Amino acid sequence: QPAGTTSSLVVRNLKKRYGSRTVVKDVSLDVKSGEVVGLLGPNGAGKTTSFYMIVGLVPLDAGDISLNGSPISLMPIHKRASLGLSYLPQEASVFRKLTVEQNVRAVLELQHDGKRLSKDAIGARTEALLEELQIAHLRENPALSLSGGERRRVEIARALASNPSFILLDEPFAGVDPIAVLEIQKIVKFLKQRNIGVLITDHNVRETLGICDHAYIISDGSVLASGAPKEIIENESVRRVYLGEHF
């Protein structure tokens, strides 16, 4: 899909059970390039399983997911990423004791053109990602010396080395200090303006709604409501089930 064009992620009628125990009955949603979409709702009522079904870590019992008109419903996580659907798992045990430059370089060493990249083109790509994420100053830092903010910028660099159309952020706000909220908002804004669509699931409603273009409230394994934040907040059923009366 050309640099300025709108990729599409289309999710229809997701369904999942374990013991039945039907955790997701029917969830449909859409995400376009440059759009930030929130996947919210009561803890355990299906937003999380829905989210993981779209990452590809939870296999569908029914439904369909298509990325630019091609189905990916059955592809595992790593193959969806090759097609430009990237998951950010927050963790730095993957970084071990390698430097920031080393971690970004290592992901580019797996890319293909359609052959291997030269050591020179890997070097140039590395520099361009560091400078774009404003972490060039962190290039020689061990992964243990990095803040949560710095770590996330590095994972973004890693993800951008695959040229994704969509990035899935798993509870980025869980347990983080209010000073860190700014950092996250800026990273999301940055993805927006690079024409990458963002799907966020979180428990932190105020933080998530504040940066979303569209949100889906998942209750009782289904979509209770969907809309721009302002419409979501004024929805009577969302207020009765999830938000409460003065939010």
Q: Can you give the binding site for a copy of itself, defined by CB under 8 A? A: 42-43, 148, 174-179, 181-182, 203, 205, 241-247
Q: Which tokens belong to 76? A: 């595992």
Q: Which one, 114 or 244, has the nearer CB to a copy of itself?
A: 244
Compute CA 118 distance to the chain's CA centroid, rounded to the nearest angstrom.
Answer: 30
Residue 184 and residue 176 in contact, taking contact as beta carbons nearer than 8 Å: yes
| Interface pattern 16-45 for Cl ion (x via CB under 5 A) | ----------------------------x-
For the CB of residue 184, give the shortest distance to a copy of itself in the complex, in Å.
Answer: 12
Q: Which tokens belong to 206? A: 């105020």
Q: CA-CA distances (angstroms) from residue 134 to 44, 215, 224? A: 37, 29, 40
Q: Which one, 42 or 229, has the nearer CB to a copy of itself?
A: 42
Partner whose binding site includes residue 49, from a copy of itself, Cl ion, none (CB under 5 to 8 Å by kind): Cl ion
Range list of H helices, 83-177? 100-108, 119-132, 148-160
Q: What is the Cα–Cα distance from 135 to 204, expressed in whole angstroms?
A: 27
For 208, phi then psi, to 5°, come to -70, -50
Partner whose binding site includes residue 177, from Cl ion, a copy of itself, none (CB under 5 to 8 Å by kind): a copy of itself
Determine which residue in the list 34, 38, 40, 49 makes contact with Cl ion, applying CB under 5 A: 49
For the CB of residue 195, give the shortest distance to Cl ion in the complex, in Å.
Answer: 29
48 sits near Cl ion (criterion: CB under 5 A): yes
For the CB of residue 87, give the shortest distance to a copy of itself in the complex, in Å.
Answer: 20
223 CB contacts (<8 Å, ≥6 apart)?
A: 26, 27, 28, 29, 216, 217
For the CB of residue 201, give the shortest distance to Cl ion in the complex, in Å.
Answer: 9
Q: Which one, 111 or 204, has the nearer CB to a copy of itself?
A: 204
Residues at the interface with Cl ion (CB under 5 A) = 44, 46, 48-49
